[PDB]
Write a protein that binds this ligand. Structure first.
Ligand SMILES: [Mg+2]
Ligand SMILES: [Mg+2]
Ligand SMILES: [Mg+2]
Ligand SMILES: [Mg+2]
Ligand SMILES: [Mg+2]
Ligand SMILES: [Mg+2]
Ligand SMILES: [Mg+2]
Ligand SMILES: [Mg+2]
Ligand SMILES: [Mg+2]
Ligand SMILES: [Mg+2]
Ligand SMILES: [Mg+2]
Ligand SMILES: [Mg+2]
Ligand SMILES: [Mg+2]
Ligand SMILES: [Mg+2]
Ligand SMILES: [Mg+2]
Ligand SMILES: [Mg+2]
Ligand SMILES: [Zn+2]
Lengths: 96, 91, 127, 25, 81, 150, 97, 226
RNA sequence: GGUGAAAUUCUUGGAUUUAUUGAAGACUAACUACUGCGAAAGCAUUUGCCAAGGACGUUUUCAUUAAUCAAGAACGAAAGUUAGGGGAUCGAAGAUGAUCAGAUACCGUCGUAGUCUUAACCAUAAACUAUGCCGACUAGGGAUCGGGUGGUGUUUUUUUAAUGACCCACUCGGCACCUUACGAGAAAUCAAAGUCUUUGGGUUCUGGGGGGAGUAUGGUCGCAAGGCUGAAACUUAAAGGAAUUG
């Protein structure tokens, strides 16, 4: 699955959470990948997609709402999108 | 403390109006007042406005749903049926 | 060189069925039953009555012009006994000896795939 | 008699006794 | 039988019988020394691996786990140890 | 006995009679102790520690190869987990199954097995509490189960 | 006292066997308890066979068969001259004819 | 029971065969025979136009009739008539089926039966539903007296059968498939595909049932009757 | 049409029937056997998804963490109850036809509730193997299911290899069965119902002649039907088990 990959990301590499932080990171291009929750507002999703294509960064559409995305990334609150700074030890960048 | 044994919310009706009726009204009022999921904004922030309305204080969207619940069994079945027919016809 | 029909012999209990049809089946011919040839209400399945029916239907088929026939023997079917009535074999013999031509005998009693419910109750018809 | 009918009769009798008792209290 | 020695029964019977029920219990496993095809790298492998152990030199494959004894790779030379 | 079942199956190791006497391995002890701690820093449990020592290397069993046992060594080097591995795995089992129930309302069989799991959890909790390896007043609860796992 | 080692059925390790229905008296009965029979008979007869053969196109055509499965209640099977009885020790016999 | 009618009328003679005439029936090309039989219908009056009532009639015929050999004794095929051309109605394929007696002989206990189905789509935009049936062997040198399966091999075999039917029907239109099943080349291919898993004798396929029909297309229909 | 036989009932307004179409709900045949799984009640069409389990293999880990259990809990056939849906077939009540002296019953034909599902209840059965659970020992036989080991063994793939399916040999754990009885019992019978006057492996539960009676009463659960707990007065010399001859 993918969730254990994200767990490896959390324990090993570097990341960031939340819309403001992710757009900030993507602004200087420190991001390698972004993951977007399903139920996010479509306007916001499209804007993030446009930023991604502008910065040549990969995007992955999670199969679920922000709530369980929060559980997958192993925090307690809900998260809209996540940005992967350094994979650290994960294969997410290489695969998919 | 468990203020009352089983009358629960309908304790406001005293000793009138009949046992079975009061029970049934309990069973409906619980749903009629509880929360649900603003699946759009993804949290527990919806209330009934009037018959069939449901409003999410977050995200400001109001969803027309069952008279006492966000969605009825008939609504679920018909939505599934529509989805099925659409896929089958386009394919 | 030959002209066929469809026999569709139905050998039920407490009666007997004989009627020849067009190969397409929509055009039926010479419908003769055990009851229409007897007044016993005991014999509407009897081999003798079936033999009478077979001879009569054979004559009718001969005059309408059909020479040979394809046999579909069929029992009560559905959820019921699925065993043919006594008269059916006698009727088939009688029609064979009556002069007609025969080919491609088969069995078409209807069997269900684990049907809904037999009548009779849990404890069955008792007597 | 058959025990099923015994218990049936006794159950009916219990119901009768219960209601005739409740008639006064 | 009514008379027979339990102290020195036949090794044929011993190998015949189950491992836990011998006169003194003992494992029926062993070790292997295997040469990875190509790179020599003689490796020590348990009989019933439960894991797909593979050579450090070239990590192609050595043995695949199975319900019984581990199933070794095709081109391999192994020695009972 | 299969304390929560009717099984009687037996399937387990039968270590050889020779206790401290392989006397046919070149590998010295420290080699394997630092190998173990090398694995441990990667976060492996003593079960697969022993498994990999048994497969990748020639190691009959740590208790004879070394002078002690794996968890003894981990405790000595200060890498002991806060809760024993078996109990940790059990609590994982419980959280997974209960999370399964949340969607599966009618799986009464799953509900059933939940009681068995939580029961063995409680009994092991009792044992560890009375051997003074868990803090007395230590209590397992469904609410804190998911967080206490990880 | 117990009459039968199997109690007159073939249930060992099951508990419930999803009964079936008598062909003759339509009574319900569990499958293992049934007195199941197989009827394999040719379609026409051994008497009319000569007649149909001599009056059959495609000489020696097929003479196809018939296969029915038969289920009876205990009382139907007994009154149908099927398995009438056997003596006390003879009951133990298992082999068919 | 001739005198049992106490009332024959809820409220209270002509010979019907003289108004009836014969019509010949014709098979398509993909059989060595073409003549089928003869059918009866009333006079095609100005109101009925008997061709209309005969537009969608159905018949059933043995394949041993279509190819002479009694080897295809059972092998039923049902045909829908579709075009009438001067007392010589033309027909088109409507279904293959197996016979009761043979198939209910095929089943004997002390073996495993396996069944599978598929709902493939043809190149002719036909929707065809196909059933497959199998019985194992007790091999030679076998001593055990029932020789059943293991219910996971059954899963593998049914998967393989499904995808084989899908592949062997897709791409093909209809007539090539008919000319496959008359010599049952797919029936032959099955045990080639499954032998390494389990014996599985008697891999006769089953009846096949059409589900959906495209436009009529008189042109290719007549091309069949060439 | 239906039986033994009739009969109620459908038919010229075309019954019974034949063919092509369509809908509805129920079920999961035949394969299905002294075979599988589950604590039990129970579970048989496909595919996918979610989690669970035994046995096997193990030179891995903990170290005695266990056995049975008052008090206390989970599940718990069908029938029955509440509120919707569904409501084909069958089908307590009921309607009707037939036998009989009578027949409110068996036999015929229809026919509400129910029979399916959802959300709650209800906790009972010959819930039977009428045999509590754990551990040890004591006679053979073949067969079978799942895992495992050995075999130049057969079959086929690509003769061939790995396979897979087979055959032989061994082993572990299952459902059983066959022969005998040292042994047990009153016997029927039993490899456990044995290892008990030569009377002691651990532990829970139940019974003390038959009726009165699972009644009265009192608590307690349930809306109810009812469940759980549960007497006495009085009466009686027999009821009962297994086998034998009639
Ligand atoms: Mg226990
Ligand atoms: Mg044991
Ligand atoms: Mg008796
Ligand atoms: Mg039972
Ligand atoms: Mg009509
Ligand atoms: Mg089936
Ligand atoms: Mg099976
Ligand atoms: Mg205990
Ligand atoms: Mg009881
Ligand atoms: Mg014991
Ligand atoms: Mg085995
Ligand atoms: Mg076994
Ligand atoms: Mg067993
Ligand atoms: Mg006493
Ligand atoms: Mg007493
Ligand atoms: Mg007696
Ligand atoms: Zn909102």
């Amino acid at each position: 699955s993918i969730n254990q990959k994200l767990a490896l990301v959390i324990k090993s590499g570097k990341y960031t959470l939340g819309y403001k932080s992710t757009v900030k990171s993507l602004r200087q291009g420190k991001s390698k990948l972004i993951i977007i929750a399903a139920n996010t507002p479509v306007l916001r999703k499209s804007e993030l997609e446009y930023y991604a294509m502008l910065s040549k960064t990969k995007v992955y559409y999670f199969q679920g709402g922000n709530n369980e995305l929060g559980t997958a990334v192993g925090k307690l609150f809900r998260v809209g999108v996540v940005s992967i700074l350094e994979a650290g030890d994960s294969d997410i960048l290489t695969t998919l | 403390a468990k203020r009352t044994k089983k009358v629960g919310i309908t304790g406001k009706y005293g000793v009138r109006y009949g046992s079975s009726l009061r029970r049934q009204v309990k069973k409906l009022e619980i749903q009629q007042h509880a929360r649900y999921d603003c699946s759009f904004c993804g949290k527990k922030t919806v209330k009934r406005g009037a018959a069939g309305i449901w409003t999410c204080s977050c995200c400001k969207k109001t969803v027309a749903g069952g008279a006492y619940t966000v969605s009825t069994a008939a609504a679920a079945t018909v939505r599934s049926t529509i989805r099925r027919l659409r896929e089958m016809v386009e394919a | 060189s030959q002209v066929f029909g469809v026999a569709r012999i139905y050998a039920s209990f407490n009666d007997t069925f004989v009627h020849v049809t067009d190969l397409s089946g929509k055009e039926t011919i010479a419908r003769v039953t055990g009851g229409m040839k007897v007044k016993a209400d005991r014999d509407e399945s009897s081999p003798y009555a079936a033999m009478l029916a077979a001879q009569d239907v054979a004559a009718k088929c001969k005059e309408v012009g059909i020479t040979a026939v394809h046999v579909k023997i069929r029992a009560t079917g559905g959820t019921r006994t699925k065993t043919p009535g006594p008269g059916g074999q006698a009727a088939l013999r009688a029609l064979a000896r009556s002069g007609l031509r025969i080919g491609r005998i088969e069995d078409v009693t209807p069997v269900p795939s684990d049907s809904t419910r037999k009548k009779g109750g849990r404890r069955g018809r008792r007597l | 008699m058959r025990a099923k009918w015994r218990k049936k009769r006794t159950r009916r009798l219990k119901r009768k006794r219960r209601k005739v008792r409740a008639r006064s209290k | 039988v009514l008379v027979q020695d339990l102290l020195h029964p036949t090794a044929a019977s011993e190998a015949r019988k189950h491992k836990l029920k011998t006169l003194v219990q003992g494992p029926r496993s062993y070790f292997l020394d295997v040469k990875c095809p190509g790179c020599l790298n003689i490796t020590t492998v348990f009989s019933h691996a439960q894991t797909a152990v593979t050579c450090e030199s070239c990590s192609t494959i050595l043995c695949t786990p199975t319900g019984g004894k581990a199933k070794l790779s095709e081109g391999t030379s192994f020695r009972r140890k | 006995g299969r304390m929560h079942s009717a099984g009687k199956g037996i399937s387990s190791s039968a270590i050889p009679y020779s206790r401290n006497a392989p006397a046919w391995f070149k590998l010295s002890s420290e080699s394997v102790i630092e190998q173990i701690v090398k694995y441990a820093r990667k976060g492996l449990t003593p079960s697969q520690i022993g498994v990999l020592l048994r497969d990748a290397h020639g190691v009959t069993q740590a208790r004879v190869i070394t002078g002690n046992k794996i968890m003894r060594i981990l405790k000595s080097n200060g890498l002991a987990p806060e809760i024993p591995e078996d109990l940790y795995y059990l609590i994982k089992k419980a959280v997974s199954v209960r999370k399964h129930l949340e969607r599966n309302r009618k799986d009464k069989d799953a509900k059933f097995r939940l009681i068995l799991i939580e029961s063995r959890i409680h009994r092991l909790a009792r044992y560890y509490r009375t051997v003074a390896v868990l803090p007395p007043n230590w209590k397992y609860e469904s609410a804190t189960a998911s967080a206490l796992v990880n | 006292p117990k009459k039968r080692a199997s109690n007159g059925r073939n249930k060992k390790g099951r508990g419930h066997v999803k009964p079936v229905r008598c062909v003759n008296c339509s009574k319900s009965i569990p499958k293992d308890k049934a007195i199941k029979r197989m009827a394999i008979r040719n379609i026409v007869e051994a008497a009319a066979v000569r007649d149909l053969s001599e009056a059959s196109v495609y000489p020696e055509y097929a003479l196809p068969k018939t296969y029915n499965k038969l289920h009876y209640c205990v009382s139907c099977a007994i009154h149908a001259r099927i398995v009438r009885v056997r003596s006390r020790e003879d009951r133990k016999n298992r082999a068919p004819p | 029971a001739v005198g049992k009618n106490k009332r024959l009328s809820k409220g209270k003679v002509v010979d019907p065969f003289t108004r009836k005439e014969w019509f010949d029936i014709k098979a398509p090309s993909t059989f060595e025979n073409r003549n089928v039989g003869k059918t009866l219908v009333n006079k095609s009056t100005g109101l009925k136009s008997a061709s209309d009532a005969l537009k969608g009639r159905v018949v059933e015929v043995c394949l041993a009739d279509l190819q002479g050999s009694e080897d295809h004794s059972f092998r039923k095929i049902k045909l829908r008539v579709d075009e009438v051309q001067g007392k010589n109605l033309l027909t088109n394929f409507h279904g293959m089926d197996f016979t009761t007696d043979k198939l209910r002989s095929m089943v004997r206990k002390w073996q495993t039966l396996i069944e599978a189905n598929v709902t493939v789509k043809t190149s002719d935009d036909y929707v065809l539903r196909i059933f497959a049936i199998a019985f194992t062997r007790k091999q030679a040198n076998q001593v055990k007296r029932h020789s059943y399966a293991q219910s996971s091999h059954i899963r593998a075999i049914r998967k393989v059968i499904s995808e084989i039917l899908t592949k062997e029907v897709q791409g093909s239109t209809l007539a090539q498939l008919t000319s496959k099943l008359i010599p049952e080349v797919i029936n032959k291919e099955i045990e080639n595909a499954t032998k390494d898993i389990f014996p599985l004798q008697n891999i006769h396929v089953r009846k096949v049932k059409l589900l959906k029909q495209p436009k009529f297309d008189v042109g290719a229909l007549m091309a069949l009757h060439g």
